[PDB]
Design a protein around this ligand. Structure first.
Ligand SMILES: COc1cn(-c2ccc(-n3cccn3)cc2F)nc(-c2ccnn2-c2ccccc2)c1=O
Ligand SMILES: COc1cn(-c2ccc(-n3cccn3)cc2F)nc(-c2ccnn2-c2ccccc2)c1=O
Ligand SMILES: [Mg+2]
Ligand SMILES: [Mg+2]
Ligand SMILES: [Zn+2]
Ligand SMILES: [Zn+2]
Lengths: 315, 315
């Protein structure tokens, strides 16, 4: 398969549309691997990786996403595309290494997800929770990334100096860890403070790591920034996973939280309203303040919030 | 009328156009019966049906389509033409009996449609729903097909062996039942799994039946695969039917669903995008995987999807 990927060319119509935040990859499944190649080439340059290695890496990444309702290969590519659009719109704020690192980190950020939350694994003493006591799945996702990199002919970072190889793995590690939404709340609070006091400094590495973290959250959640019908269908996939986790809990005699309880579908519109107000809107608001060209993400999120409000009022 | 049909010759300027998936029969109403004869002849051969019986059959089928906005004679011929194009592009795969059966099934697949959904007939205890509890209209369509065959001078299959006759009727029965969209979702999910696990085997009659079922769906929905002006205009006919059904419900003091509600007219473009993502795209995607020459249908579906997005966005 990776050999066919090498001759792929993005159709011209898509070349225009792919640059836009609202682009939905959904209708183009056969093209997703080629879309990632395209994005890496446009953002990082056509000789950034050896094509054969990049194509082998991409195909192995795809193979290592499971056929679960939401945390699947489609999700990986959707998140990578949102990152592409953020980077393209803020290109010179980030180094070559950061752009490479972040695109790869986005593609890999949910590798081998089994459709269960960190809370579930920790509460029910899964072996991954023994290995990774905090940010359990996210450490596993980074573990999986390194594991794929070290496969025969898969090492896309082979030409880097050791120093730069270390830097990029560290960029990738931090970015993947930051997708643990438990970490987002504190991150966003610190950044909002820094922005209000006028103290945010991108040349300050700790400030920089925080901005990158927020970008990762923004990308991870971007299904809430698509057109309404797309956002609604994605919500169905997200809840399919939540409910399947809740069902496992009920078998072990434990009441799930409302969002994981399929007997509480009525509260979904209000659940979505609550998530947009407490998580999504704040995320894209802070992002827009730090990186103004990302405003369309906030606008789109606001549009979908409005749609959920309509659902609540009776439509 | 059936006599004048026997003399019909398709205009040469249409001999290449008619082979294209995106061919629109729209401008050629007086030719529709002759177009069906032409397609039968090229696909099944001028030998397989006695011309007079075929011509009488076609004319009785036409008269048994009602004057409804969408499920009318034009839709019958449109669906038959898409099947013709699938069969012509995959000519090794299907037996003589299958090609015969499938063209006939498509022409007859909505016979005597009244413009009401199965859900409606079942909800309001229509006699047809008392008779056929599931796939209500589709069982009716098949029954109408058998009734027409059993008219004097109408049995186009009279020269088949007793065995061939019951086989072809079963092919038609299964093909018409498959056009109940309620059944498509499970059919396509099964096929996707079979393809993905490499267990799909066209020696297996149950597998053949599933593939034929998907082809039927693909042809039934093929208005979403025409050039944009044709697709857009057909969408009006479809909603005219949905809305008349919703209106019939209001008259009875009963609240129709969003799709049936003419007060949700402004939401049509969003509803189309939803339908394309949830139904049409997966349909033509799976079909293209199983039957690569059907690829132009998926390509045309994607093009119309982007047109609906542009409508939503106000482009
Ligand atoms: C109530 O509705 C929702 C709830 N959560 C949600 C998810 C996770 C956590 N969590 C707490 C601690 C760690 N993780 C909390 C949450 F609230 N996420 C989404 C959502 C919208 C788009 N991606 N995304 C998503 C993000 C991650 C996983 C699944 C879905 C959502 O729509
Ligand atoms: C919202 O837009 C649409 C919705 N449906 C639609 C239709 C049916 C069902 N159903 C019946 C039973 C279970 N489910 C669900 C549906 F969603 N069909 C079309 C469509 C596009 C092209 N043919 N075709 C069509 C197909 C069949 C009937 C009418 C129209 C459409 O455009
Ligand atoms: Mg994750
Ligand atoms: Mg029908
Ligand atoms: Zn994710
Ligand atoms: Zn039909």
């Amino acid at each position: 398969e990776w050999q066919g990927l090498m001759q792929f060319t993005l159709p011209v119509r898509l070349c225009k549309e792919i640059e836009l935040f609202h682009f939905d990859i959904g209708p183009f499944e056969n093209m997703w691997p080629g879309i990632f190649v395209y994005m890496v080439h446009r953002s990082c340059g056509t000789s950034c990786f050896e094509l054969e290695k990049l194509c082998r890496f991409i195909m192995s990444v795809k193979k290592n996403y499971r056929r679960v309702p939401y945390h699947n290969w489609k999700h990986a590519v959707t998140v990578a595309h949102c990152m592409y659009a953020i980077l393209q719109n803020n290109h010179t704020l980030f180094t070559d290494l950061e752009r490479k690192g972040l695109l790869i980190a986005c593609l890999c950020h949910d590798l081998d997800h089994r459709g269960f939350s960190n809370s579930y694994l920790q509460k029910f003493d899964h072996p991954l929770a023994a290995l990774y006591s905090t940010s359990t799945m996210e450490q596993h996702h980074f573990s999986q990334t390194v594991s794929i990199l070290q496969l025969e002919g898969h090492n896309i970072f082979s030409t880097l100096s050791s120093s730069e190889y270390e830097q990029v793995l560290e960029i990738i590690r931090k970015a993947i860890i930051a997708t643990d939404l438990a970490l987002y709340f504190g991150n966003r609070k610190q950044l909002e403070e820094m922005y209000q006091t006028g103290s945010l400094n991108l040349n300050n590495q700790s400030h920089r790591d925080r901005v990158i973290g927020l970008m990762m959250t923004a990308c991870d959640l971007c299904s809430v920034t698509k057109l309404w019908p797309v956002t609604k269908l994605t919500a169905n996939d997200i809840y399919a996973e939540f409910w399947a986790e809740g069902d496992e809990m009920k078998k072990l005699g434990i009441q799930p939280i409302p969002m994981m309880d399929r007997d509480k579908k009525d509260e979904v519109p209000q659940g979505q309203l609550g998530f947009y107000n407490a998580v999504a809107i704040p995320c894209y608001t802070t992002l827009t303040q730090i990186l103004p060209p990302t405003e369309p993400l906030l606008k789109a999120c606001r549009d979908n919030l409005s749609q959920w409000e309509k659902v609540i009022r009776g439509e």
